[PDB]
Amino acid sequence: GGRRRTDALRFLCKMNPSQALKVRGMVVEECHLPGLGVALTLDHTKDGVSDLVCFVSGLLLGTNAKVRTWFGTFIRNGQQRKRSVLWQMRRQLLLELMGILPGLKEEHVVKASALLRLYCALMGIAGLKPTEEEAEQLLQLMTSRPPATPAGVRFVSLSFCMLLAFSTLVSTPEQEQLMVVWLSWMIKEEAYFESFGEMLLLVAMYFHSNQLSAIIDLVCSTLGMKIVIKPSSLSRMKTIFTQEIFTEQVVTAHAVRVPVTSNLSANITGFLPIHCIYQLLRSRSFTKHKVSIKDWIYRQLCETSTPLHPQLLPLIDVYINSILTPASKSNPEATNQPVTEQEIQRFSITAQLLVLYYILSYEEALLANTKTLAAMQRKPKSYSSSLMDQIPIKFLIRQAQGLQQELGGLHSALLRLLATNYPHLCI
Amino acid sequence: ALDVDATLEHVQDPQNTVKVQVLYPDGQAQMIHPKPADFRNPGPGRHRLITQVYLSHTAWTEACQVEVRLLLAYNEGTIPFSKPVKVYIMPKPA
Amino acid sequence: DANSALMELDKGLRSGKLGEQCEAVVRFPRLFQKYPFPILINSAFLKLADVFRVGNNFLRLCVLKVTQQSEKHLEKILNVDEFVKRIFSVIHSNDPVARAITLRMLGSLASIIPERKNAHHSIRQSLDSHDNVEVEAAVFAAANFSAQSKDFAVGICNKISEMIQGLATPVDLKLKLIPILQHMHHDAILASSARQLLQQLVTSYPSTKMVIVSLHTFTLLAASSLVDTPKQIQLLLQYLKNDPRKAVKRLAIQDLKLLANKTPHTWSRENIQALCECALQTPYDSLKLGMLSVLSTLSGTIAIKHYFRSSDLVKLAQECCYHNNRGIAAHGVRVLTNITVSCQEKDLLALEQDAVFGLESLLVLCSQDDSPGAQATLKIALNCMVKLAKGRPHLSQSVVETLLTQLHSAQDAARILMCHCLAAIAMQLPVLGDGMLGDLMELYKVIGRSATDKQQELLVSLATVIFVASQKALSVESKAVIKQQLESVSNGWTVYRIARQASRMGNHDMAKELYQSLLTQVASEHFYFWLNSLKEFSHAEQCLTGLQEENYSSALSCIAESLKFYHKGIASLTAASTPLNPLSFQCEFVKLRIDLLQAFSQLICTCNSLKTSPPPAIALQRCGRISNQMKQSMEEFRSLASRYGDLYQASFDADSATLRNVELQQQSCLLISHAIEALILDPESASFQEYGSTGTAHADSEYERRMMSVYNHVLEEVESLNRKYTPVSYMHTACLCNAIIALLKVPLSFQRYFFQKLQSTSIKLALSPPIAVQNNQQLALKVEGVVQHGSKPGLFRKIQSVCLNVSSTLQSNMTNEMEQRVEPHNDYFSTQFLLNFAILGTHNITVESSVKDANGIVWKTGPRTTIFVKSLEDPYSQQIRLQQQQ
Amino acid sequence: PYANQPTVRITELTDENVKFIIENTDLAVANSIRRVFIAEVPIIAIDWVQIDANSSVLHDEFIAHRLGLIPLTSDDIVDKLQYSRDCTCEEFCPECSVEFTLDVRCNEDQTRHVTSRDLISNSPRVIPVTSRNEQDDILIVKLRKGQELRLRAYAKKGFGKEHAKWNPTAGVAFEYDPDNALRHTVYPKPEEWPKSEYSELDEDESQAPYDPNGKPERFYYNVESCGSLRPETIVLSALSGLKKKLSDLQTQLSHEIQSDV
Amino acid sequence: XXXXXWXXXXXXXXXXXXXXXXXXXXX
């Protein structure tokens, strides 16, 4: 019933090649005979990437879920047959893979990204089990060296999220060591952190916290689709980062080299680097590995937009605790220009209010800590009284009153600090 | 039974024009004609309407609503007359 | 949890420390925003009132700030009496600060306690207190309560009057005390008494601050209470022409500006005459500019028709047209342009050229300076000359010519605005485009790299006016533009915007080249697929330009090549569809274009199948298979018309231009269906008096002009060839099959909704009931939805009613067809449906969300959410039913 | 001084049992969870039988006792139902009870098996478990010719602390420390003791080395349902019920502290 | 001032177009 129809319509489209892929369009529209449409887009390929990759990427990744399920069931049923148009598709896709693999050229990296996300779609929805040659060529394409363009950043992000997504395509120690040497090469690279470094740091935090559930969500968000991963497949992946690749020392040293989220707010949702920095400061990791977080905290506080992110106040609180705990001493914000200049070039009012909140909370922590510190004289390191004269506390809380709804609990906590510490400003 | 109290103001002939509409959550839009006996007239241009309208339907899985509305009828069609008012109704099974 | 967070910030207000207590108080508005539940807002407000009653004055001020910030939530507390009573208990405090804070509470709560008489008495008593903060708070409370209650206003009007003429009251407190009379807009006699008091008050206290405040509150009373306006306008004009202070004149000017913005129709001719006479004999440019701003606001309304030869307004506009001040010149030009385009009398023919040359002089003055204030006057002048060109068509040639002559000798930042003006003019009058192409192309050539920041905007605007001006294609100018971008701009965003404008105006070969130049510049593969699809669409529309005339074989070749490229493009376009911002409109529009082109190709195949495949052996009927072929073609084209209509109804976020484009495509396929019907199927039944009343052809674009010209030509050919031939005719196939060529000769225009998503709105539609319901019971669909306005909520349209249609289809038909038009009140709606399931089994129900706008147009936009309902039977009822049946 | 952070790993989910592991919690919490599994998860069971006719060889108390032990489907209805003592009706009402009717007359020479198919509910969702739409039906009584059983039964809400007919579980398998690292039990001869199902030792080992710093965590469960509730619903309603008991005790303790102070 | 200028009035920047600008601008 199927082969005769496929041969008849392929002969008809051979007789009329002008409307040949219009019949592929009717195949997609009617959701009948998928292999016929595959043969139609294969037989008429005699610039860009190719038409086949666009066609099946649109099938698997389109808005229409019925077409996606129909093509996925087609590929799933075609896998069970003895090694027929599905194998022609796979051979064409493989020879397309070798057409760009060397690192990659700066113009072929987007083509490689599109092919790689096509393989994502195939192995995620279709249940396609790649061959040994397919897996070897795919992994060779994983470990390429892009020219560190934003296209290259997208390329390495997709490759890394596929290593997380499909850990069943290595199965060999040689591809394992190739993977980890590529990972170390990507880690020691500096221009990638301008992003990909946020993803690397966040998945390192998630394996250290043994989450392995929003790892799936991050992979699904980066690939842009839902895949069943079976996190027991990621069990060997966790031990590679946890014990060998992303140790606590190197993730702590990476935590300061990641750029801050520019103009972060409650509008910028999702799991941000500020959350990972807050989790590390909760565990006192920076003092445990002698890494300076003062510069990163100041740079993150200096760039904030008019809605208040809910993580900023706990981050400031745990940073102050990290300064004043007897475990060690994180360096406070310096008394000069990073505070005086910050409260004079055109810094945001939320930045000024956050710095004022940090200063007043540091004052209360100092006054509630020296009763039981008994550690060192340089451990408190109190701010100068001449500095506080340059801080318009009443003025800043006056602006904070007018933007109460744009701040989460910052105006409230600043009011509490003012009422406890400066009752002469609360008349 | 549902009791209503309508404050009709400046109605020329409320005896034969003012009608009560009950609208169930389904398509039922039963239209009730009040009798002239309970169109009280406490003043010039002021009228009071006190009817005990009657509501019934089979079982509901949840207390939905009912829509009670006064209507004005003319010699061929009817137009909305009062503010739409929602009343909660819960027909429990026997 | 809501109550858990309420207890979490409730435990802080017995802390004893004032800091944690004010913490607890000021956390309340965030709780109100998170949990807007009346039974919980009630308890929160009652304990806020309790801590107000027992707390110190700073806590009371914190409660006041919370109450001010939560004014929309305090209408839903419903335990008003005890809450207001426990706040009001500390009006009797001997502390004047506490009394002041309570008066500010009462004024803050005046929306929910009008006609509350003890509050009125407390405000009246506190207005006579000896403490300044208490009197100021009483003034604030009186201003709030007078706005919300007319019984408070009628006595407080007399009280405020008697304590204004009371000289024990100081001047500054008088100044604070005048604007209470603004809220006298309740009764006509109340407003009249307030106006009499204000008239005595202005002459009684002729201080500059007193006259400013009294005139402003008199005009706010006159604007709010509408039966005061002509006498207020004449009072303002009298004080503008007689009072010598500049501040009083400035308030009179800005106040007449407010009254002209609000109610321009109530201005008499005498008021405009008096304002013009004020503008003639003033010596100050700062006052004349404001007076001309008021007159230019009045000029754009119907007050000119009430005003109307050469009058004082015309002479004033001519005088201020030639003024050394640029703002005065801009206002005079605006008045002249509004007078010119307002009517068509014989007197304005002289001042038409005056307006043109004043526009040209303002262009030559405002272009070479690059001042921030010069760009505003330049925008005013260019908008005025756009209005002059559109309102009156014949003189547009001189406007275009002076823009072209000014373009070569102006600074760069001025050139973007003149390019915008020239593009706005050229889309309405197409005959002016081709004559200005050479000068604009030379201007494009002489750019090179002679800018660094405005170069990108100037490049995209000047390429835009090239594309609008050139109705035909480009041969060497395209290569010169390509070389200019390649040498100058490596920024691919400028290339993308220029290609976007090219595909907007139908220059598709240029767009194809620019999209080929852009495929290596993107980072995400999604934008790569999007750009590749755009490249293929532009290539296919370029391939459609090979239709010369009457050649149906070359027509088939060009349509086949265009179809090949165009659904290669849709193959690469659906790969760019994302879960977040999918390419839904683009995919539907491209699919409809594919279907239209395929139907065109099938119809040309039927043209050829007239002469080929001769008629059957039969002694309408006796025509062969071609009768059924045109029947199927008519059905396909009518289905295409319905699908273009449902795309129109499903868009709802497009411009007027994109909606007009979709309507044009729908009219195209409707025209083809009617051309089939009226001269193949049934010429006798069809061809009624379908004479389109082609009067004011207000076609906004050149593409629209071409489409309606093609429609008129094809309809005239169909009417002229209605019954002149037998239904199996060579002229019928020829005229229809050349109508195909005439329709496809004009290139397709991709509009803004294809490229930019503005007014992103949707329905969440979170319904609440495979669910199972008993056979005897009726299911209740408590369906609710929230709309999601993105950025501008009402940029093009606004939702008036959300029409929900729900129907039930058994055996997962359509028996529970229900409809309810619910109105969302806070961008949220909720209604409840009653669905009956007598037939046992799985019932697939679906719910639609149609949106009716302010104009009454139905837009089918909402999701089609489906849930399955199972009708399981009671075991007792099943046993009873089987016993009764058997 | 604060709460545990317990984790759940579920190793087997079936319509008849749930087999899960709770880690990082205390032994008392785990044992109380098991006790609420057995005793304090409310289900619907028959607790009011009116016998109208009983010609069977089994007397009325016997039939009523057997009817009480028939499990009924209780999912998402036991939460809506009030307790019969707490409801304000005079007799039973739909808001606190489910009415059952049985009327079997044996007129044939063959023995009539009165089963749970003959228990006819007035609620479509509270039905006997064997009547769900494989397994046979719970036999109530066998009837010979001439014998009949007509009765009206009312099924109400209760928990296993009152009567074992409201116990929703069959077997609550509970384990901790399968290798006896804590030496909480002391084998005189550990060699002859069989390994636990959750044991993590080799065949040569008999028990783990003694851990002096260890506490009981990693509690192993196998909650087999009798069919009245889904086993996952049994666990969820047990956690909710223990939470509710603790919250009620918090409320009464707060009132008592407020009244005393 | 054209009422239908696409490049002008770029205050209503979308999501796809903003990302496209960020991707094709700095390149």
Ligand SMILES: [Zn+2]
């Ligand atoms: Zn009851």
